[PDB]
Amino acid sequence: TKRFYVKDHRNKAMINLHIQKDNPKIVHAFDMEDLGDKAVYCRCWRSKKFPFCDGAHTKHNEETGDNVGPLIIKK
Amino acid sequence: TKRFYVKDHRNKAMINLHIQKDNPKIVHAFDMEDLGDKAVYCRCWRSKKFPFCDGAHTKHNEETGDNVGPLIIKK
Ligand SMILES: NS(=O)(=O)c1cc(C(=O)O)c(NCc2ccco2)cc1Cl
Ligand SMILES: NS(=O)(=O)c1cc(C(=O)O)c(NCc2ccco2)cc1Cl
Ligand code: FES
Numbered sequence: 476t477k478r479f480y481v482k483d484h485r486n487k488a489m490i491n492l493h494i495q496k497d498n499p500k501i502v503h504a505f506d507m508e509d510l511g512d513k514a515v516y517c518r519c520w521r522s523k524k525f526p527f528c529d530g531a532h533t534k535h536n537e538e539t540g541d542n543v544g545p546l547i548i549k550k
Numbered sequence: 551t552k553r554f555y556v557k558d559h560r561n562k563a564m565i566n567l568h569i570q571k572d573n574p575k576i577v578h579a580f581d582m583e584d585l586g587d588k589a590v591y592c593r594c595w596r597s598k599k600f601p602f603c604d605g606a607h608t609k610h611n612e613e614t615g616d617n618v619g620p621l622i623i624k625k
Protein backbone atom coordinates (compact mmCIF):
# COMPACT_ATOMS: atom_id res chain seq x y z
CA THR A 476 0.00 0.00 0.00
CA LYS A 477 0.85 3.65 0.29
CA ARG A 478 -0.15 3.85 3.96
CA PHE A 479 3.39 4.86 5.05
CA TYR A 480 3.84 7.62 2.45
CA VAL A 481 3.21 11.33 3.02
CA LYS A 482 1.62 12.64 -0.16
CA ASP A 483 2.95 15.62 -2.08
CA HIS A 484 2.10 18.74 -0.09
CA ARG A 485 3.05 22.36 0.31
CA ASN A 486 6.00 22.61 2.67
CA LYS A 487 5.54 23.59 6.28
CA ALA A 488 9.03 23.03 7.73
CA MET A 489 11.40 25.85 8.52
CA ILE A 490 14.80 26.11 6.86
CA ASN A 491 16.54 28.17 9.55
CA LEU A 492 16.10 26.63 12.99
CA HIS A 493 18.22 28.74 15.39
CA ILE A 494 20.12 31.61 13.72
CA GLN A 495 19.21 35.18 14.77
CA LYS A 496 15.61 34.30 15.55
CA ASP A 497 14.87 37.82 16.86
CA ASN A 498 15.50 39.10 13.32
CA PRO A 499 12.30 38.68 11.25
CA LYS A 500 14.21 38.34 7.93
CA ILE A 501 17.94 37.62 7.87
CA VAL A 502 19.65 39.47 4.98
CA HIS A 503 23.38 40.01 4.52
CA ALA A 504 24.97 42.57 2.25
CA PHE A 505 28.67 42.85 1.42
CA ASP A 506 30.67 45.23 -0.78
CA MET A 507 32.90 43.45 -3.30
CA GLU A 508 35.74 45.82 -2.33
CA ASP A 509 35.86 44.39 1.21
CA LEU A 510 35.94 40.77 0.01
CA GLY A 511 39.32 39.06 -0.16
CA ASP A 512 40.29 36.42 -2.69
CA LYS A 513 37.47 34.02 -1.79
CA ALA A 514 34.27 34.08 0.27
CA VAL A 515 32.20 30.91 0.76
CA TYR A 516 28.64 31.67 1.90
CA CYS A 517 26.32 29.28 3.74
CA ARG A 518 22.97 28.46 2.07
CA CYS A 519 21.92 25.75 4.54
CA TRP A 520 21.50 27.81 7.77
CA ARG A 521 23.47 25.29 9.83
CA SER A 522 26.96 26.81 9.83
CA LYS A 523 28.36 27.87 13.18
CA LYS A 524 29.99 30.76 11.26
CA PHE A 525 26.88 31.78 9.35
CA PRO A 526 26.75 33.60 6.94
CA PHE A 527 30.04 31.78 6.02
CA CYS A 528 30.05 28.10 5.09
CA ASP A 529 31.73 25.80 7.61
CA GLY A 530 30.92 22.43 5.98
CA ALA A 531 27.81 21.83 8.12
CA HIS A 532 25.88 21.29 4.88
CA THR A 533 27.49 17.84 4.64
CA LYS A 534 25.78 16.70 7.83
CA HIS A 535 22.49 18.33 6.76
CA ASN A 536 22.60 16.53 3.41
CA GLU A 537 23.47 13.15 4.92
CA GLU A 538 20.85 13.30 7.68
CA THR A 539 17.97 14.62 5.55
CA GLY A 540 18.76 13.34 2.05
CA ASP A 541 19.08 16.95 0.75
CA ASN A 542 21.59 18.30 -1.81
CA VAL A 543 22.33 21.91 -0.72
CA GLY A 544 25.73 23.59 -0.67
CA PRO A 545 27.38 27.00 -0.52
CA LEU A 546 27.73 30.02 -2.78
CA ILE A 547 31.26 31.08 -3.70
CA ILE A 548 32.39 34.56 -4.73
CA LYS A 549 36.02 34.54 -5.83
CA LYS A 550 38.84 36.57 -7.45
CA THR B 551 -0.82 19.19 28.55
CA LYS B 552 1.98 18.98 26.06
CA ARG B 553 0.29 16.25 24.01
CA PHE B 554 0.16 18.44 20.86
CA TYR B 555 3.81 19.55 20.98
CA VAL B 556 6.67 17.95 19.06
CA LYS B 557 9.65 17.95 21.40
CA ASP B 558 13.03 19.39 20.48
CA HIS B 559 14.66 17.01 18.02
CA ARG B 560 17.37 16.84 15.41
CA ASN B 561 15.99 18.06 12.11
CA LYS B 562 14.92 15.64 9.42
CA ALA B 563 13.29 17.95 6.85
CA MET B 564 14.95 18.93 3.61
CA ILE B 565 15.68 22.55 2.78
CA ASN B 566 15.77 22.22 -1.01
CA LEU B 567 12.68 20.44 -2.32
CA HIS B 568 12.93 20.55 -6.15
CA ILE B 569 16.01 22.37 -7.49
CA GLN B 570 18.53 20.32 -9.51
CA LYS B 571 17.78 17.11 -7.67
CA ASP B 572 20.10 15.07 -9.93
CA ASN B 573 23.01 17.12 -8.52
CA PRO B 574 24.12 15.58 -5.19
CA LYS B 575 25.40 18.92 -3.80
CA ILE B 576 24.42 22.22 -5.40
CA VAL B 577 27.32 24.73 -5.30
CA HIS B 578 27.60 27.96 -7.26
CA ALA B 579 30.79 29.89 -7.88
CA PHE B 580 31.05 33.35 -9.44
CA ASP B 581 34.00 35.63 -10.24
CA MET B 582 33.62 39.15 -8.83
CA GLU B 583 34.77 40.52 -12.20
CA ASP B 584 31.66 39.14 -13.93
CA LEU B 585 29.26 40.58 -11.34
CA GLY B 586 27.55 43.86 -12.17
CA ASP B 587 26.58 46.51 -9.65
CA LYS B 588 24.40 44.21 -7.53
CA ALA B 589 23.71 40.47 -7.24
CA VAL B 590 21.03 39.17 -4.86
CA TYR B 591 21.45 35.46 -4.10
CA CYS B 592 18.72 33.09 -2.89
CA ARG B 593 19.31 31.31 0.45
CA CYS B 594 15.84 29.76 0.71
CA TRP B 595 15.87 27.34 -2.29
CA ARG B 596 12.43 28.48 -3.46
CA SER B 597 13.32 31.08 -6.11
CA LYS B 598 12.24 30.33 -9.66
CA LYS B 599 15.51 32.05 -10.69
CA PHE B 600 17.74 30.20 -8.25
CA PRO B 601 20.57 30.92 -7.47
CA PHE B 602 19.18 34.52 -7.69
CA CYS B 603 16.59 35.78 -5.21
CA ASP B 604 13.13 36.41 -6.65
CA GLY B 605 11.28 37.26 -3.42
CA ALA B 606 9.97 33.71 -2.89
CA HIS B 607 11.48 33.85 0.61
CA THR B 608 8.54 36.05 1.65
CA LYS B 609 6.07 33.25 0.99
CA HIS B 610 8.37 30.70 2.66
CA ASN B 611 8.65 32.86 5.77
CA GLU B 612 4.92 33.55 5.99
CA GLU B 613 3.85 29.92 5.45
CA THR B 614 6.43 28.31 7.78
CA GLY B 615 7.14 31.02 10.36
CA ASP B 616 10.82 31.17 9.24
CA ASN B 617 13.04 34.27 8.94
CA VAL B 618 15.40 33.58 5.99
CA GLY B 619 16.39 36.03 3.28
CA PRO B 620 18.99 36.62 0.57
CA LEU B 621 22.68 37.41 0.38
CA ILE B 622 23.67 40.60 -1.43
CA ILE B 623 27.01 41.33 -3.10
CA LYS B 624 27.18 44.92 -4.28
CA LYS B 625 29.43 47.67 -5.72
N1 LIG C 1 31.63 21.87 -5.88
S1 LIG C 1 32.81 21.26 -4.82
O1 LIG C 1 32.44 19.92 -4.32
O2 LIG C 1 34.07 20.99 -5.55
C1 LIG C 1 33.12 22.39 -3.43
C2 LIG C 1 32.65 21.99 -2.19
C3 LIG C 1 32.84 22.77 -1.06
C4 LIG C 1 32.29 22.26 0.27
O3 LIG C 1 32.61 22.81 1.36
O4 LIG C 1 31.52 21.25 0.25
C5 LIG C 1 33.52 23.98 -1.17
N2 LIG C 1 33.74 24.81 0.00
C6 LIG C 1 35.02 25.46 0.24
C7 LIG C 1 35.03 25.89 1.71
C8 LIG C 1 34.56 25.15 2.77
C9 LIG C 1 34.74 25.87 3.91
C10 LIG C 1 35.32 27.07 3.55
O5 LIG C 1 35.50 27.08 2.20
C11 LIG C 1 34.00 24.39 -2.40
C12 LIG C 1 33.82 23.61 -3.54
CL1 LIG C 1 34.48 24.22 -5.10
N1 LIG D 1 17.09 43.97 4.50
S1 LIG D 1 15.89 44.55 3.46
O1 LIG D 1 14.54 44.27 3.99
O2 LIG D 1 15.90 46.03 3.42
C1 LIG D 1 16.05 43.87 1.78
C2 LIG D 1 15.10 42.93 1.40
C3 LIG D 1 15.13 42.36 0.14
C4 LIG D 1 14.05 41.33 -0.20
O3 LIG D 1 13.89 40.93 -1.39
O4 LIG D 1 13.30 40.92 0.74
C5 LIG D 1 16.12 42.73 -0.76
N2 LIG D 1 16.17 42.14 -2.09
C6 LIG D 1 16.43 42.95 -3.26
C7 LIG D 1 16.00 42.13 -4.48
C8 LIG D 1 14.86 41.35 -4.57
C9 LIG D 1 14.84 40.78 -5.80
C10 LIG D 1 15.97 41.19 -6.48
O5 LIG D 1 16.68 42.02 -5.66
C11 LIG D 1 17.07 43.67 -0.39
C12 LIG D 1 17.05 44.25 0.87
CL1 LIG D 1 18.32 45.46 1.26
S1 FES E 1 27.71 25.14 6.04
FE1 FES E 1 25.88 25.82 5.09
S2 FES E 1 26.25 25.69 2.92
FE2 FES E 1 28.10 25.01 3.88
Ligand code: FES
Nearest residue numbers: 592593594603606
Ligand atom coordinates in the same frame (compact mmCIF):
# COMPACT_ATOMS: atom_id res chain seq x y z
S1 FES F 1 13.87 33.97 -3.10
FE1 FES F 1 15.16 32.78 -1.82
S2 FES F 1 16.17 34.21 -0.49
FE2 FES F 1 14.88 35.42 -1.78
